[PDB]
Amino acid sequence: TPEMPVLENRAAQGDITAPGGARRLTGDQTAALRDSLSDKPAKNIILLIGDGMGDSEITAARNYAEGAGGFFKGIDALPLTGQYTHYALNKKTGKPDYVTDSAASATAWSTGVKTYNGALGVDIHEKDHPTILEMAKAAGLATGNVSTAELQGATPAALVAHVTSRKCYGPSATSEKCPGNALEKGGKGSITEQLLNARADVTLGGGAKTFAETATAGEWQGKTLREQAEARGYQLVSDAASLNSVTEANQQKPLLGLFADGNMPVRWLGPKATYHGNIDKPAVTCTPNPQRNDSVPTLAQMTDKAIELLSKNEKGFFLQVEGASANPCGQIGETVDLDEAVQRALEFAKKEGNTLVIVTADHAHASQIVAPDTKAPGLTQALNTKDGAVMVMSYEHTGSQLRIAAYGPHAANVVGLTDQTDLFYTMKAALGLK
Amino acid sequence: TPEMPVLENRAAQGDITAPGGARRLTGDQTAALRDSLSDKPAKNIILLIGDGMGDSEITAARNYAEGAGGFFKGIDALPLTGQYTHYALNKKTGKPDYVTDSAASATAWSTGVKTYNGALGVDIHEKDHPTILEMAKAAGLATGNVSTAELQGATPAALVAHVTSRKCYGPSATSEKCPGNALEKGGKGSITEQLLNARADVTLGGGAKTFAETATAGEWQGKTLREQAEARGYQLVSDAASLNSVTEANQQKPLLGLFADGNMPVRWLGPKATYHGNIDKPAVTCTPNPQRNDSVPTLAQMTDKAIELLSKNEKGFFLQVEGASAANPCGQIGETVDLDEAVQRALEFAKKEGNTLVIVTADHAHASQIVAPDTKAPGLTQALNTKDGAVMVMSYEHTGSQLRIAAYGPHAANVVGLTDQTDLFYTMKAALGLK
């Protein structure tokens, strides 16, 4: 039965200077697309999120790494595409707030309810709403959360924590900034304490710093959150070797991989963009970061490991993978990173035939690709792309709708204009979560 | 009984502060989407181009005019959506120039070949290439060209002119800037002269000022290009009353409507954005432009008259419609609202007819960004009171980002995913069965 093609090749087909040369299509999509459509139940969902990765950021990364007529074998290979909205709510008025932050957006797709800038897992009345991971887990499904940023960061945090502020990282900052959530005040705990209670089968990322914090109440008081994790049965892993030896990870043995104190390392380094840096400075070539290491797993590696462990669950799985860390090279390199994770996800999804893979961003950032002769009011940098031509980028969250792309069962629900909260109901209905 | 659906409503379905209230979907989309897939031939194509309307401009205009949970009934209603690239090429090297201008992007979807910035209907070796309008016309189809900007502007002109510089509006300018296209030098003429030769069945837009120039050579030397068009059998209309009087337009009697000397008047008036304008000035509400007129045909009126006159052709039609007419948030949003009225008209037609492909996209993305109210940005900003009674701040060039392309109809499936601007030429070719 015609089981779902991925976009094969959408690179410029020939000589870009010639008629028909820059075409990305070799024919008519109608029947490929017809076979891309299935409404049958998604057994697994993999959701890949690029921090700030709107259309402008995908274009600049393609231009740099693949060349303008190039194609990301992961990000651009998803057959169903649409645009979605992500406005937040002003807390006092409940009126729309056109420019969201990462917390409210992360909340909108994990719980399906709009909230205010700064909130995680709570609506504007500070009430908690259940996340898609809490719900997958309640249904007996394996669950995993992966990031290259701090695990306390808004996108990973929003699946496991419910606090009135994204800053309530650990006990210290919670007593002070989220009193109603402070464990001492009967609240549910900080983002890191709620993480530990939440017991996702696979959690992997940065942010080991706040795990050194110590509990102020509860049966693990005085112990640090790392000690509590181990005390609760988590198998901790802190490099690529240990992650690779892990054979099983489940509710009896939750894997928790902490690979960086803050954010895990950035793939490429470059100079900072400067005022008139395109006029007054050379075109940049990005340097691979020497200090990324064979000890530190990559986002693609974490993704593949997580898929390996989570797929042993005979009921299905949910997995969120976040690709996060005026530095254009570091920006572009993280989109390359994520593309490799999407690729792996698609590799699994095609083979399995019952996985919805979704790639999108939390919200748009402010860089634009601009004409190389520009006198911007800002920070620019000219870059040497794959094409041997220079691209100037110019430099903060923005409110623009952005791309969401999908492959697999129920992916039709991302085509057209949707809203970020619809993603929760799409995933929930795909997974049959009742 | 099959009919292909348009998205009747993807507004937030309820209370946006409550669970499920901000959903734009009320259920599963699969079945509606397969009912939207058809490879059958398209009899007609209506292509609407939003001048600079990338995803930021669509969102900014929806928030202001419809509210954040709102829905543009034309623009957001097209069920098959994708993203397309639109880079130009460097003329000297043939290497990509990541940020196109209007001329080079207009050449790419009308001719299918990439080119350099400033070029109309010629490739980087200055070779002319048939535009999709010339080929539809060559095949016996009715063709139309409507704009709110000057007819000599990059987007309407790319359909009918082949010149080495977009600035080659009329005799004067072609002689000095495009001397290899100057009519008194054996070239094909200015944009206006080639427009007159291309003899599309309906051409409606602004730009009457250059028709006041006199030709330098040829059969109509010394006559103005307006006297020429009359002498060549064109029916000229210059206001809404006479436009609605036209009964037919075809090759014997072709319609040319010149409603303004330069661009047609802007829908909404508002101040220009300003440095620290979102903190130093109150929020703006856009007001109707007094000069927009009763006498001046709106873009949905022109689109509607064009479809009427063009559907008299037993064989089908091709129609391109351009919404265009200075860091002014209200003119900018007014024109997206304009174009959305035009898209609803095209879509009522297409939905009724059953064999029309409607594509709505932009030539290239512009640079306005929706920012946070309290932003201290280095450009020009302005705060605006939206339909929600909330403030939206806008910040201010062309940019290189890929942008939205959306479609409805037979062959509309070929806009989904990542395509390139020149793929649009081929999707039109193939839909329409050309060549």
Side-chain angles (χ1 to χ4, degrees), chain A residues 84-107:
Chain A
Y84 73 2
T85 41
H86 41 81
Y87 59 95
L89 308 178
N90 169 300
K91 196 191 182 166
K92 209 55 214 74
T93 55
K95 279 181 187 301
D97 196 351
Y98 301 111
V99 181
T100 192
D101 86 326
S102 323
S105 42
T107 298

Side-chain angles (χ1 to χ4, degrees), chain A residues 70-251 253-361:
Chain A
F71 155 82
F72 277 125
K73 285 78 229 164
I75 293 169
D76 296 322
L78 299 131
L80 292 174
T81 57
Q83 293 69 35
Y84 73 2
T85 41
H86 41 81
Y87 59 95
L89 308 178
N90 169 300
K91 196 191 182 166
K92 209 55 214 74
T93 55
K95 279 181 187 301
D97 196 351
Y98 301 111
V99 181
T100 192
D101 86 326
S102 323
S105 42
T107 298
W109 75 68
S110 46
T111 59
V113 62
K114 292 272 187 186
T115 191
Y116 58 94
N117 275 351
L120 291 178
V122 296
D123 48 37
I124 51 164
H125 305 305
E126 306 186 349
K127 323 289 174 51
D128 309 337
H129 277 272
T131 69
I132 187 65
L133 191 152
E134 286 170 346
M135 296 188 62
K137 189 175 174 173
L141 262 53
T143 53
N145 174 14
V146 174
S147 174
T148 25
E150 7 225 31
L151 281 175
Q152 300 77 25
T155 295
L159 274 26
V160 297
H162 305 262
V163 295
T164 60
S165 164
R166 65 181 303 171
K167 299 156 173 304
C168 293
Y169 266 37
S172 338
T174 316
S175 307
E176 206 169 288
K177 280 158 188 286
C178 298
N181 303 111
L183 199 64
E184 337 79 75
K185 284 180 176 52
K188 208 123 85 285
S190 59
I191 288 157
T192 308
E193 291 178 284
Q194 291 196 50
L195 187 326
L196 259 19
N197 296 341
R199 186 165 282 234
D201 311 88
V202 180
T203 307
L204 302 160
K209 200 240 209 234
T210 302
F211 272 80
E213 213 123 292
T214 178
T216 56
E219 28 175 299
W220 294 288
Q221 176 177 11
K223 253 63 161 276
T224 55
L225 270 12
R226 182 181 157 155
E227 266 173 78
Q228 182 196 136
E230 317 195 76
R232 290 177 70 171
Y234 280 66
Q235 38 175 165
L236 271 63
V237 147
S238 39
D239 60 30
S242 37
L243 177 53
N244 270 251
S245 23
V246 185
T247 14
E248 36 252 331
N250 43 49
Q251 285 304 300
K253 282 172 281 94
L255 172 63
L256 172 58
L258 299 144
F259 308 105
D261 273 341
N263 292 308
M264 284 178 84
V266 274
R267 198 209 188 101
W268 296 345
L269 311 165
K272 206 191 91 275
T274 46
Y275 170 77
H276 277 352
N278 65 309
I279 293 148
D280 294 359
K281 308 242 275 70
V284 161
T285 291
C286 300
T287 299
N289 181 9
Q291 281 152 9
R292 56 207 209 193
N293 287 281
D294 250 68
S295 41
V296 186
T298 44
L299 186 59
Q301 281 169 325
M302 287 195 286
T303 300
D304 215 64
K305 219 336 172 203
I307 298 162
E308 189 213 289
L309 298 178
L310 294 173
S311 50
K312 310 260 181 55
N313 178 303
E314 179 90 298
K315 239 281 225 184
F317 76 75
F318 167 81
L319 174 60
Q320 182 169 275
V321 175
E322 184 215 7
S325 287
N327 189 62
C329 288
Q331 176 197 138
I332 293 171
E334 288 312 285
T335 311
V336 174
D337 260 320
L338 175 69
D339 176 68
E340 298 178 342
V342 182
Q343 270 181 73
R344 307 288 185 240
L346 287 175
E347 204 184 294
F348 171 79
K350 297 182 290 76
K351 271 172 280 291
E352 202 274 313
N354 302 276
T355 303
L356 169 61
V357 172
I358 294 157
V359 176
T360 188

Side-chain angles (χ1 to χ4, degrees), chain B residues 221-245:
Chain B
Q221 173 170 2
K223 315 279 139 265
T224 57
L225 307 173
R226 191 174 177 209
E227 293 181 277
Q228 177 176 151
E230 305 186 64
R232 296 185 67 170
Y234 282 87
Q235 8 188 11
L236 283 76
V237 294
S238 42
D239 54 57
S242 35
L243 170 61
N244 254 98
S245 317

Side-chain angles (χ1 to χ4, degrees), chain B residues 81-396 398-426:
Chain B
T81 47
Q83 290 70 50
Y84 83 177
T85 42
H86 48 85
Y87 56 98
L89 313 164
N90 177 269
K91 199 218 246 291
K92 306 277 63 111
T93 65
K95 277 185 168 183
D97 179 327
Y98 301 107
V99 181
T100 191
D101 80 329
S102 189
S105 43
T107 293
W109 78 67
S110 38
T111 250
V113 76
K114 295 284 178 175
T115 186
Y116 62 100
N117 285 336
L120 285 171
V122 294
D123 59 17
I124 64 164
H125 309 294
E126 303 182 355
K127 199 251 262 214
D128 300 358
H129 291 261
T131 75
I132 186 70
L133 183 146
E134 293 173 339
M135 299 162 49
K137 192 178 174 195
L141 275 65
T143 59
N145 197 8
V146 182
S147 175
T148 31
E150 297 169 292
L151 240 22
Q152 306 81 11
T155 327
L159 281 189
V160 300
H162 301 269
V163 288
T164 53
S165 169
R166 67 179 298 148
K167 308 178 169 305
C168 281
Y169 270 32
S172 253
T174 309
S175 300
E176 156 135 43
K177 290 176 146 102
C178 304
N181 306 115
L183 196 72
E184 79 291 357
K185 261 77 157 188
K188 274 176 159 154
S190 63
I191 290 164
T192 300
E193 279 166 299
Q194 288 177 57
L195 181 152
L196 251 12
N197 289 322
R199 205 186 182 83
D201 302 281
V202 186
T203 295
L204 299 171
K209 199 220 189 183
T210 284
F211 287 80
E213 283 196 67
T214 57
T216 53
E219 189 182 350
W220 296 287
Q221 173 170 2
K223 315 279 139 265
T224 57
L225 307 173
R226 191 174 177 209
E227 293 181 277
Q228 177 176 151
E230 305 186 64
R232 296 185 67 170
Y234 282 87
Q235 8 188 11
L236 283 76
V237 294
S238 42
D239 54 57
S242 35
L243 170 61
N244 254 98
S245 317
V246 178
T247 288
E248 242 291 78
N250 55 41
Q251 289 301 290
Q252 314 125 177
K253 289 230 81 346
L255 186 63
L256 179 66
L258 294 158
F259 305 109
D261 274 18
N263 304 293
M264 274 165 97
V266 150
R267 193 191 177 97
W268 289 347
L269 246 41
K272 241 211 51 159
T274 246
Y275 175 60
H276 283 339
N278 59 315
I279 39 226
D280 287 331
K281 274 109 188 293
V284 174
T285 290
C286 303
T287 196
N289 181 353
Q291 302 207 113
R292 60 164 56 168
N293 256 284
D294 205 282
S295 63
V296 183
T298 62
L299 185 63
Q301 281 168 339
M302 293 190 294
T303 299
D304 213 73
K305 196 47 172 168
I307 300 170
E308 180 207 293
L309 296 183
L310 260 22
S311 45
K312 315 275 230 274
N313 194 311
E314 312 233 326
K315 287 297 79 178
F317 72 87
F318 168 80
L319 172 64
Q320 176 176 290
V321 181
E322 187 199 17
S325 306
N328 182 291
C330 285
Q332 183 186 145
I333 296 171
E335 299 314 271
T336 310
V337 171
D338 278 322
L339 173 65
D340 179 79
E341 284 168 10
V343 187
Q344 289 179 69
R345 298 290 182 100
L347 220 29
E348 340 277 4
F349 173 70
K351 198 164 54 64
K352 184 178 169 292
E353 199 282 309
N355 313 287
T356 301
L357 170 47
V358 179
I359 296 154
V360 181
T361 190
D363 50 342
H364 57 176
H366 275 176
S368 54
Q369 290 178 295
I370 291 161
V371 296
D374 63 281
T375 294
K376 249 179 152 56
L380 308 185
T381 44
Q382 180 178 91
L384 296 148
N385 304 115
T386 60
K387 216 222 183 200
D388 300 311
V391 167
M392 178 177 70
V393 177
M394 252 160 88
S395 206
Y396 294 98
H398 344 295
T399 61
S401 182
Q402 64 190 24
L403 54 95
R404 188 172 94 122
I405 185 156
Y408 171 70
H411 294 260
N414 292 286
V415 297
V416 181
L418 175 74
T419 60
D420 179 81
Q421 197 154 52
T422 61
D423 281 284
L424 184 54
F425 172 80
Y426 291 104

